[PDB]
Amino acid sequence: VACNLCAVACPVGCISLQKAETKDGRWYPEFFRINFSRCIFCGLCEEACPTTAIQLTPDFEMGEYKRQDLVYEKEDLLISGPGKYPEYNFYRMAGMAIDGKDKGEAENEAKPIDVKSLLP
Amino acid sequence: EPAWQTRDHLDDPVIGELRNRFGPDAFTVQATRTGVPVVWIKREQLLEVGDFLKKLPKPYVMLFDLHGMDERLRTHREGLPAADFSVFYHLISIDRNRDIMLKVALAENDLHVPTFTKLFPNANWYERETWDLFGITFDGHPNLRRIMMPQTWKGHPLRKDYPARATEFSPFELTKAKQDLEMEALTFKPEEWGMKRGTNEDFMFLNLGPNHPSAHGAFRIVLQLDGEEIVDCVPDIGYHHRGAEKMGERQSWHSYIPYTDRIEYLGGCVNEMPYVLAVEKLAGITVPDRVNVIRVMLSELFRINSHLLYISTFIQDVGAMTPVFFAFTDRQKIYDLVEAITGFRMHPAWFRIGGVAHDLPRGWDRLLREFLDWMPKRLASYEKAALQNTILKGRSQGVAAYGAKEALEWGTTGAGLRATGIDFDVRKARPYSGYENFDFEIPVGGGVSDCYTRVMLKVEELRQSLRILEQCLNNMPEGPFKADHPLTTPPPKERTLQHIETLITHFLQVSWGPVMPANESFQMIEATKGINSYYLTSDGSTMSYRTRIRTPSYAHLQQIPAAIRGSLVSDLIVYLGSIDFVMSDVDR
Amino acid sequence: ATIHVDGKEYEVNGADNLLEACLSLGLDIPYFCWHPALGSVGACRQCAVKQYQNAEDTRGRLVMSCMTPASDGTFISIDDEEAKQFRESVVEWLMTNHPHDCPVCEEGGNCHLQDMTVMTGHSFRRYRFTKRTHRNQDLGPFISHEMNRCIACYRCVRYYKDYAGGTDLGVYGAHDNVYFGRPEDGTLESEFSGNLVEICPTGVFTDKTHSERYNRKWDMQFAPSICQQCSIGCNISPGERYGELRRIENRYNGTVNHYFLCDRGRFGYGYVNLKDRPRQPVQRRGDDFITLNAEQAMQGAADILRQSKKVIGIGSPRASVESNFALRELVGEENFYTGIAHGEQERLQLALKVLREGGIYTPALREIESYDAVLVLGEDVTQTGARVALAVRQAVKGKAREMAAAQKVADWQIAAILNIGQRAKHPLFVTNVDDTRLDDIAAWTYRAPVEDQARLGFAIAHALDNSAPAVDGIEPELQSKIDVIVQALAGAKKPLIISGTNAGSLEVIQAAANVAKALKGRGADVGITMIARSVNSMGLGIMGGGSLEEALTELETGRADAVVVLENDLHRHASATRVNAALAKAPLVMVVDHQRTAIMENAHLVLSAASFAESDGTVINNEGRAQRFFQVYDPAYYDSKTVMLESWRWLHSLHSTLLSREVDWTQLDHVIDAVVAKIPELAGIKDAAPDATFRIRGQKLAREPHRYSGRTAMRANISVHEPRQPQDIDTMFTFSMEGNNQPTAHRSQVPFAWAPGWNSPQAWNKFQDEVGGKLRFGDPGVRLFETSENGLDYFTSVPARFQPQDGKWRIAPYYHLFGSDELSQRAPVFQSRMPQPYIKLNPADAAKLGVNAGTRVSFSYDGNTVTLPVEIAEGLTAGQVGLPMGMSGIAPVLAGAHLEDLKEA
Amino acid sequence: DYTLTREIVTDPLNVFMGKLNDMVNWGRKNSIWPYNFGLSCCYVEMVTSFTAVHDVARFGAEVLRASPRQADLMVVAGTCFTKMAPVIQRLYDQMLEPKWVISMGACANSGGMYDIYSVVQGVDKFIPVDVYIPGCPPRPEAYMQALMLLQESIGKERRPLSWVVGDQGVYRANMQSERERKRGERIAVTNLRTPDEI
């Protein structure tokens, strides 16, 4: 959701991203880049992530010929599935309305009561 | 009263003794969370106070630490003397099992203190580092030169107005320093290093560094030799200076933990433990018992890893090469367990303020059982193949021996101090992290700290750590892995993912940082190579105002010339192999 | 007064409540519904402390510290266990319905509710039931609305209605369904609605313009700057990220603009991020353009200017004092000309002469709120100097404050003060050509032409003092209303006379000066305020120089062949055809500017000047206070091809390359010393800020927060090798985290407010000596001139009555907050807020010409006919036609002018 | 594609000369002698790769040399401290052609987590690097993977056969980045094992 918590939690400062928003109001990263020549694989970004988006996976074979190619953009990071957390969805919890979830449709949320309602 | 509560320690008998000797208005007692009495002494009374402490009925025999502090940006200095800078002296009385921290206040222009080297000889390197990083002059010092930075360095990096970040790289300065390196071999002046009698026309001068093909790191020693006899030796250290304390002033309390990992890089969770304990003292957090047992088990696993590396490296330094292969196989078993628990091998960064990062994974006990069944036969085989060999005994026994007095006067801790016969282990004398609930022994020497005696003491420490791991495996509480304190950083992840209050706490803790109220805290632990301590000053902010790390390898490297003078060069290599140091621990 | 907090004795003001007294002492009490500018109401119940009856009391009683006076001998406890439990419970009650929104909420990291949740130590949720939800409203282009996050602290409605005087915001519904917003979807009509994003402690009201390009507060690079969009001089904190200006926060100045901006300053920054901005020097060869670096541009421009026979300069009230002075040094004082028109210059120098030779004190913007009668002559204050209108609203509420003080009601108990002073208010008399936004609180509104407004002012002055010149031919009803004004002003203990140059009449300013002199001669404590047009109008008036028409005649006669134009769109101050002719005739036109102006197609050289975000300088507000603005970011950090320098740096380098054939750029303090050495009337700008060698215990002042992130990845797509930190040799600020931003640091320039545990705009409490007062070591900025010992004489040139003429339509100015300031019109978010340009007609004149509302009429000005649709204006008197000044095609110089051949299209 | 040093050029490569140059490259890539150089923790994982549980000797790259004259590969495994940077430069200059460089760990790659006053931000500030390994530390098998990447780079390069006959330019293959090569399989990953188990 491009909340920028992982970038500020990174002690090396090797995460850079910018928030964009869809038409229905869903936040997402416009870009997301990680300088892996700086990254110490400490896992503080995964710990800080409130959506379980960013994850450290069992893969060590990341050797490279050019150091510029260790800058991984969003196309090199976004995978096809949920990874280590198969079911969590932050947008099922958030009160912010997106496509497919109007106000009052999140978890533990009541339907909105308009102030012009006849009930006391 | 909790163990993290702020105390003035006015009921310490040393405060009454100082009252009786120097009067009540001669000093100011400061209430801290360091756990030791902190006394602000006038500069002109420092030598008298130190001599009085040295001449007590149960005396303060060891200068544990000596360093400086830039107090100019410290907003919360209530009940403190006016000071632009300060110098602190941490002294340990072994017989009392007590400490005291003397503090001398200094103005910005009058930045000179009388030297402490006549009372404690380890004050030489400590005052050289204080002069190097703070610009504080010590009057009467034999050679007050820079020890961390190169001699042609401008400024003092631990001052608050010094910028922490790396400057722009210039190849011109690199070529100038290369020319300095290649001209130093031709224009060596044996007076600027504290040496005397610079060629009797028989003293050959050799260099051992600045590159060393070993795991303890790369460093330079200048040797003055008469034939094969070392008549003088001065070290050149600071070749692995990483600015870890300055970085402590730059990272938040949470984001500094991976930096604590890389102080003594064979120690891992052992290195993390004193930092998180000191931060929890600042936060007022008492961790639950399962956290204590988890941290103890991780620290003992990493202690076994480090001791196996040390014993194998010593055997390789003697001349037998196969036990390092087998000890690295055992290290791979330990790394299998540590990888399973923390997800990393060497720098797990797994301890947290108020607990650990995750719960233990399902099935960790099977891997611990496999390691505990694998280890003892291998250790016995190592002993029978290499440690009982008479060639190794001839290389090790009687080499670089010192007694209790020399160990105390140089701040020697760990296996060397216990090999001198002094029974001082932090896990028993000043217990931490629930170590009192474990049944284990502290091996001590007969009175002579040899290379062989230190190695065998480390072998018995490995066996005791195996005993602690067996008790950890058999007795695990089924509780939380994180304390329920609001300053537990980060909060438990599932509550963060579904509760807004926990989400808010997590948001502010990982971004701006946890707010530690203004205090000073201290924690020393028995590390793999001696006593490792963190001294943290919070000015009320989300980062440390001052992070001071005392490491034992610094003291052991400073003790090197006192124990090796008059010996052979091969004895110096064996002594270097038997110290159990790393240069990252030395330079920080 | 003596209070005892947790066993510690403190000396406080007895007229303060306990919350503000304790926050002034550095103690931390959580609070939501209290604000320093709004007073106390006791809604949120967050500020609970335990009050004891005396020293030997142990039970105590929980009280609200915001509603409890800090009287002598008070005994309270903040850290009492019951008080801490209740404050945590209040946080918990607010958290029961709060949405799980912090990652996708624009307030995160800047949220007062987050900070107080952490401060109370509440982190465990035991509530398990459903959360109430709300639908959101569309509130216009600036403010985004999210009512789920509301904690019902009532700050928004109290600020918007009671403080700002807005009418379209309110609280609706009942018990836990209280809803804060508008009665229906629509744009917030207040000119000060943008302060809601800082007033609201949660993420209900958010900066939508920031939300388009959102980033967190810790990721911003801040600088202390001055708002450029009018002459008031409100202190701002521009914050940038990734090379673009992201946000304008209010920067607290206890003397100027304390907590509040206007919406023009807060949201009219978007021109800085325009893609058509000049990034590098461009020189045209034939019909093609080539890009030069700065050294080649200096060498070529110096060679061509050296070949020329006479170089003249055209400054701008947009540009700073340093850049205008550097232009005046490059071309010479006798060849320097101000970029404003002749009549505009005459009105500006008359306003300056009244300000610094009239012998009557000119108050600062905060000081306006203490005057007990206000007469506004000609100046549509809300659309031109909006923060002055806000201050005048507070000064009007001063009467309710006085009646509440008579009944021994504390000055912070705002509900009691409003109840006592029901609708009683200090007298406000506004005059304009039409209705103003101050009419809802004005005791009287005079809709008349500018000469009739001046005649009213001269008649008021003559009725206050018989030595003032008389006005002959006053109607009895107008005479009775004049007597009402005179009786209100004479009995006032502190009258304030506000005027300005926007009315477009010299006699209005003279009438205001005569009223001020007549009130001064009766021993009253009269203040006078002038409203200039642009950010450095008063600085250009103090520097002086010939008018733009003199420079146009120099370029048209041909005796000047080279012209430098600094930060000036010349079509605003002169007719476009004459400017285009004089610039097409000129063999050398050089334009130093930061925006793509219309005179850059006839410009032979264009220099990429820096905007205020990328430059340092000094600007003079209409109070006469010199204020220093600082560079926010280095434009060459992300795009290394960008050659965008300070204007004074460009012009000084040009003068150096002209004289010694060598390129020396300059330092800022050298230009400051040059200004104060050549110009003694601008000698105060040396003391506006400390020089670039200023340190806080040896270290510079930081521009970015401590947790500034992404430093090894924000440029990693360009190159993985990190560039050097930008160097600031100009000022005492560093372009990095390696600096000082302590609230106790001995400085007056604060780039942003942050304290540990206070991440919201409430950290300005920590940056103050007392909360709601001034900054701890004084507000920045110094006054250039003091009050003169002797005043002026009465201006005897009373203008005649306005007579309508057939075929001659006198242009009445209609300024707009969104549209009359050039750079703010260039901001893309102001196009949605842009009113459609309607020409205003009297019903009688429109009936005579046979045009209804909405019909297009074409009028001819300067030999060019343009068509605008008709809006019927009842208050506009006959013989006048209403035009929106400063818009696209309608220059502000057209105010007070006549118009010919207005025909139906 | 190739890079020329003495410029982006094409492949210069008779049928006997090409085969014998391939045999030269095969002998160079199957006989790599690393230099013994301990900087920091990354060196501990490097010598872990040398031990029995990993056995990097299988690749023929176990011959650790204390002399730079007999070493073909320099593995910068550790932080480039400002005092150690002239030492690293002198040791690199003491090596003989052909010489290859592997940066091991984030410190050697970029400075890593030590953007500090006493640390050079990456060894490529002053020494050319052929293979970079991210990690802090990289595990020993990552060092072995970088060794294989170095062998692929060596087997595709063209060096002067003799100093008296032929072109003396050094040709280095501009290989495809490993990120773009593995993007096909890395993005297709859907489900990973949950961190609760072992």
Ligand code: SF4
């Ligand atoms: S794992 Fe890498 S990217 Fe994530 S916080 Fe640590 S250093 Fe930064």
Ligand code: SF4
């Ligand atoms: S990866 Fe997670 S922590 Fe980082 S911006 Fe995205 S949602 Fe936030």
Ligand code: SF4
């Ligand atoms: S208003 Fe504050 S507490 Fe609520 S979702 Fe936004 S950042 Fe979180």
Ligand code: SF4
């Ligand atoms: S919308 Fe904001 S300011 Fe208004 S009552 Fe709710 S939380 Fe308070």
Ligand code: SF4
């Ligand atoms: S009143 Fe003027 S100076 Fe103040 S914010 Fe508005 S436009 Fe800017």
Ligand code: SF4
């Ligand atoms: S990259 Fe990490 S493991 Fe390697 S030398 Fe640096 S701190 Fe040590």
Ligand code: FES
């Ligand atoms: S701040 Fe006092 S009750 Fe709200």
Ligand SMILES: [Ca+2]
């Ligand atoms: Ca500048």
